[PDB]
């Protein structure tokens, strides 16, 4: 079966584990980012972005609502969440949240 990078051999992640994920995301000052894409080739690097990174993040429920909106408008596409660091300039966490 085709796999989808990190956190892809588990049973589907529950919402509470997603909330804990996001809390650890914001704990060390990383900022969230939402990407959605059609195909899942392993030679493609860039994905289409959605709005801007939420620099004014105040709660996990905000990013949960953003993911809910992303599924509402583009539910027929792969949807994943990444996180950025402002001091080492390299992203650190990435996983797939919504599957077709």
């Amino acid at each position: 079966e085709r796999r989808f990078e990190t956190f892809s051999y588990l049973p589907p992640l529950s919402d509470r584990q997603i909330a804990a994920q996001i809390e650890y995301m914001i704990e060390q000052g990383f900022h969230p980012l939402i990407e959605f894409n059609e195909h899942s080739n392993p030679e493609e690097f860039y994905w289409t972005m959605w709005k801007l990174p939420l620099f004014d993040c105040k709660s996990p429920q905000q990013v949960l609502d953003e993911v809910r909106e992303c599924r509402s408008e583009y539910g027929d596409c792969y949807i994943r969440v990444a996180g950025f660091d402002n001091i080492k300039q390299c992203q650190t966490v990435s996983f797939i949240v919504h599957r077709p």
């Binding site: 690097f45 860039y46 289409t48 972005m49 300039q89 390299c90």
Partner: peptide, 17 residues
Amino acid sequence: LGLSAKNYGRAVYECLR
């Protein structure tokens, strides 16, 4: 100046599309 390679590519791709 100050952008890594991948962020440079992402900015260019967003500007181009």
